[PDB]
Design a protein around this ligand. Sequence first.
Ligand code: CA
Ligand code: CA
Length: 993
Amino acid sequence: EQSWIPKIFKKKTCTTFIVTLCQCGRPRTAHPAVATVWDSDAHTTEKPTDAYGELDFTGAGRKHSNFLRLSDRTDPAAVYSLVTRTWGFRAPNLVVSVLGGSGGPVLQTWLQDLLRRGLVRAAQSTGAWIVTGGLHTGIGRHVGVAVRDHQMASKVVAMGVAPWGVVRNRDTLINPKGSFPARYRWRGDPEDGVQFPLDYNYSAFFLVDDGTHGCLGGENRFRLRLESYISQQKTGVGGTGIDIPVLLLLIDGDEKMLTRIENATQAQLPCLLVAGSGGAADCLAETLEDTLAPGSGGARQGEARDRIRRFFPKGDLEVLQAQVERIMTRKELLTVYSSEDGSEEFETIVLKALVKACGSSEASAYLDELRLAVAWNRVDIAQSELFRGDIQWRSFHLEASLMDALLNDRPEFVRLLISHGLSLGHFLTPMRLAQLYSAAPSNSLIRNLLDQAPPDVGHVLRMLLGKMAPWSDLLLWALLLNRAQMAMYFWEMGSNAVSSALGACLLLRVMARLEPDAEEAARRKDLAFKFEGMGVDLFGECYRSSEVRAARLLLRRCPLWGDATCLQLAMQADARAFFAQDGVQSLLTQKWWGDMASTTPIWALVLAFFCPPLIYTRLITFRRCLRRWFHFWGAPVTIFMGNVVSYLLFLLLFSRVLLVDFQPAPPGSLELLLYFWAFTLLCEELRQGLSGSLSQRLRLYLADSWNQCDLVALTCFLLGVGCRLTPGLYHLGRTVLCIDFMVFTVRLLHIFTVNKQLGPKIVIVSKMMKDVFFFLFFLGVWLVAYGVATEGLLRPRDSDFPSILRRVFYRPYLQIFGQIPQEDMDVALMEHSNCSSEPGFWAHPPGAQAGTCVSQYANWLVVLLLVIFLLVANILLVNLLIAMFSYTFGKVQGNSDLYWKAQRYRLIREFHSRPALAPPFIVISHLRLLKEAERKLLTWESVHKENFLLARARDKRESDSERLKRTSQKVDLALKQLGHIREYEQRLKVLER
Ligand SMILES: [Ca+2]
Ligand SMILES: [Ca+2]
């Protein structure tokens, strides 16, 4: 699989001998028989490489480390092609060449923290490369341990170049046919100062061969050539890609490092220097700090720095000064990274260095910098540098960046790119949308839905909602992928803003209910709440602007979201806060009163209902006569009042029949009328269920508690009729009909839900069930204990299971409500008599169900138990229940009010489609049963949304915190200008004298 590797690469040997010890490092005794000044290329022999393979470090590791030995005189193009194609390494978006000596086995804690936190994280984020020394020493060791720490805390392709000869255990790497299995003794016990082990954190190794036993600086030429070639290469895909930025990071160093950085600046490579690193690196930082310092008093400052910031050797020599001057001749390329007391953030510094290194008006040269800015989450640097207006951009130049920002969840970046005159409509294509949807994160819920379902999002939406403009598509994609800021921005640019917000809330809630992550669902619910709040604010502003237009058209309309009104969307989403606002409540009241004025008094309505001619007077404010009659009798409130009156009459008839007319004889006229009335009620309930996708509407109808109560009442009535008509089940029928009448009477509580001050009371009463159950359980346990103890102590002689159960449960239960049979428990209140032959003394209670006679061995204990039971039950439990009720009532007032306001719409919709006749007469009604304006309204809504967003932005900018930020920036700019003025004044004073 590596046949061409020995052919396209070469290895260098010592060949000639140039002295007992050569400059080549190989002794004359072990020297080729072919044996002034040694020459790297003239005194060497080229041979095929015999050290390539994949290293597998013993112990922990990835079992994959491509190692290659190549001669110094090799074109970097072949090496780069080998890495990109044969080894499968992806084209890097960035190459960072960390350089320096870093004398000392350990480095500063702040420096190591900066390395690990900035460089490795940035490389992981952008998929960069880190090219360092391929040895376990100094900066190579530091970057290796930083990469290891980052890896174990989560990959990063951190390569390494090392000279051939300074590598320990080079004997095990030789296999001409391939070293794919390779064991390396990196943990070797012997230690030496000339050969170093290879780090186990590097993905690849390039062993530069120069025909020496091992030295330093022999890989510098190949390193620089590789960096320069990579700097002039595209990110794969041939010429369709963009250039690969290359940056050099220098930490400490020596004269060799100074020559390296000078050559790199000559080769037009951006460089980055860290302040505080040490010698040979802080010298450049101090020189940049001086900047255009005057020669007078600064000419000797160079020698001063060379003597204080560098070692005494070569400090007096001016060759170092010449190198410094050559470096400063091209100071534009390189920059200095201020420590800033451990900033641990240098992505902005890298972006600034890269943007200042190019210096070209063409936008093609800044594509790599824009991609790096998009990969990171900093937008101020990109806007200030790339989008300063000097660079002329284009839609096709920004399309790839927009795609990358969308895929990588960069909301500020997509906002900025769209803001810069980008045609979104022409940008979006079906293939791009398919890519966006395929960019789902791993095995997410949306990914599962896509797999179950060419995006084919219509099927997913139909299966989620029920199935009963690029901005909309982008909003749907963001909601499906759960991107909060993306969804917010897309909604801000939408057309049907209120409907979009309500549908977004519905979709987020229904997907959170379906999401098994148990943590992403919380974020979905939070985003749904945010969208609901935005919709509430927007609709409130629209209603305050024009009540009629908003209330009429904006809600009662069918958009393209689901072909359902906004009220229906809110009801499905259970957006209680949407119904809580005053505009929605006013619209609901207007619909509830129909064609009648919402200010019509209740007594006037009752008088009109009981006096039909009264509707043709000034009492009620709204052919003409028939129209008025149908308007009055079709209003939902009148339907509700008629239904209430009919239900009261039905209950009265039921009570009359059950109490008087219910006889074992065949049913009379009134009983038949009651049967017909119940049949009509059943027909009405069936109509409600069937017309409330048969299964979906049926289960929606069954979801209401009142509908369940009606169904169970009708079932009980049917069972009662069946038992009554049975020849031998009259009593059972009567009993079950009594229970059914109780259920029908309990059904009457639905009336109070209409009243504004009573519905929340009903909701709170419904919520009191937890406290009720707790009290019931505690009371049941205490009753069981006390009853069993008292029954055991008394020892009544009845000993009958029904009587035992009575004396254990029923009597102590009645003792709670003041029914205390003292004469049945206290022996002192009952006469003594002989009843049983059992030993002891017995007394005869006067009660009928208290037993024939009870024991009187320890009756003071019975009295004490009675006292304790009375205390506990009648005081402690009752007061605890009262306290719990008070606490619950105080706690859930607002939630109950919101729930009532939400269900008010459901009630109004239920009574909007009910037949206009009463249930007794509903049989005949059942038998009879069986553009420019839209665009103007949307423009008005969009204008109001824009005004709301502008007002919110103005409020945010006018806040105290933002004002403090702005004044701090102003003070900083003033200080900078004052420093410039001080320098100018000093220069002018120097020149004048
Ligand atoms: Ca560039
Ligand atoms: Ca019903």
